[PDB]
Design an enzyme around this catalytic site. Structure first.
Site, PDB file in Angstrom:
ATOM      1  CB  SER A 137     -51.977 -11.952  40.813  1.00 15.04           C
ATOM      2  OG  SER A 137     -52.123 -12.584  39.549  1.00 15.04           O
ATOM      3  CG  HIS A 192     -47.816 -15.442  40.307  1.00 17.71           C
ATOM      4  ND1 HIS A 192     -48.066 -14.170  39.839  1.00 17.71           N
ATOM      5  CD2 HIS A 192     -49.018 -15.956  40.664  1.00 17.71           C
ATOM      6  CE1 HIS A 192     -49.364 -13.925  39.914  1.00 17.71           C
ATOM      7  NE2 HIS A 192     -49.963 -14.994  40.404  1.00 17.71           N
ATOM      8  CG  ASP A 201     -49.701 -18.774  42.364  1.00 17.70           C
ATOM      9  OD1 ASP A 201     -48.770 -18.618  41.536  1.00 17.70           O
ATOM     10  OD2 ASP A 201     -50.536 -17.878  42.653  1.00 17.70           O
TER      11      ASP A 201
END
EC number: 3.4.21.-
Length: 309
Positions: free
Chosen positions: A249, A67, A30
């Protein structure tokens, strides 16, 4: 805890079946992870596959700043955010923004060639996103090889925007979810678990896929293995406050946490057995067959119970 704990059967008695004495490290491939707040004690390792050589998230984009930390929190946060399996540790592999070429692939190759990883360390690989604009030759070689090895699993988001994956062109499909083996052997050993996102529901209610042209779940029978909670999901930010998101996600992170919990019970189990138990134990909804292979919806109670028993 959050709504999705009861919805997927992640109850106290379910969690009692896991082995907290067996270390489980989930790989988070990520944008980098900030080991702060509920993730303060979660770090196993951190790696860079980006052009700045840094394992830490950067402020280039707000979404990319947060994220990796968000996903890590959903898997493993010990307080604040309720991680699915808070006993897990996290290995951060930063691949965006400004990745080296095929940074996603370099990240995975790095796991695959590391013989010093114990069973259960980076067995479950979380990819809450991936690469499009894909000569899917490098991906296809790597995934079929990982399949043959039968040791690790990749949990891959099918992507957002609500598109039907069956109608997208090859350039718009997100990898490694887009891995689409056609041989009997490659299908049977396929190490990818492709995750779609569900709208909020209570146990007993029939789930529907989270919709929308922005964060709405992509979908399509034979291109999605399972659907999981993916709406109204609270997560951790690097500045220690929380945000709320919807999409694949988040759904992917949740599935990875369930697989992490299962692996605690036998980290030496084959990838095939873990994948099979997850899929077999999933609730099957006839209404979802067009959107998800066999209409599969994540059932953590059954997955964990079956695998751990």
């Amino acid at each position: 805890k959050p709504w999705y704990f009861d919805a997927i059967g992640l109850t106290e008695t379910t969690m009692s079946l896991t082995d907290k004495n067996t270390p489980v490290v989930v790989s988070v491939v990520d944008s980098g992870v900030a080991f702060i707040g509920g993730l303060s004690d979660s770090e196993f390792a951190k790696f860079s596959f980006t052009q700045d050589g840094s394992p830490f998230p950067v402020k280039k984009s707000e979404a990319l700043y947060i994220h990796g930390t968000a996903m890590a929190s959903l898997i493993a946060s010990r307080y604040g955010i309720y991680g699915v399996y808070p006993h897990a540790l996290i290995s951060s592999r930063r691949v965006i923004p400004d990745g080296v070429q095929d940074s996603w692939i370099r990240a995975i190759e790095s796991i695959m060639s590391n013989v010093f990883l114990a069973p259960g360390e980076e067995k479950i690989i979380n990819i809450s996103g991936g690469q499009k604009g894909v000569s899917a030759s490098v991906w296809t070689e790597l995934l079929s090889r990982m399949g043959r090895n039968n040791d690790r699993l990749i949990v891959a988001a099918v992507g957002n925007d609500g598109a039907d994956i069956r109608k997208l062109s090859a350039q718009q499909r997100i990898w490694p979810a887009a891995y689409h083996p056609v041989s009997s052997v490659n299908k049977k050993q396929d190490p990818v678990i492709r995750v779609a996102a569900l709208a909020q529901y209570r146990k007993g209610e029939t789930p529907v896929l989270h919709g929308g042209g922005i964060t709405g779940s992509r979908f399509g029978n034979n291109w999605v293995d399972i659907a999981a909670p993916g709406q109204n999901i609270t997560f951790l930010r690097p500045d220690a406050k929380t945000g709320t998101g919807s999409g694949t996600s988040e759904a992917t992170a949740i599935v990875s946490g369930v697989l992490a919990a299962m692996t605690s019970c036998n980290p030496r189990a084959t990838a095939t057995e873990l994948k099979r138990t997850l899929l077999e134990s999933a609730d099957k909804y006839p209404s979802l067959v067009d959107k998800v292979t066999e209409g599969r919806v994540l059932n953590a109670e059954k997955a964990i119970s079956m695998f751990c028993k």
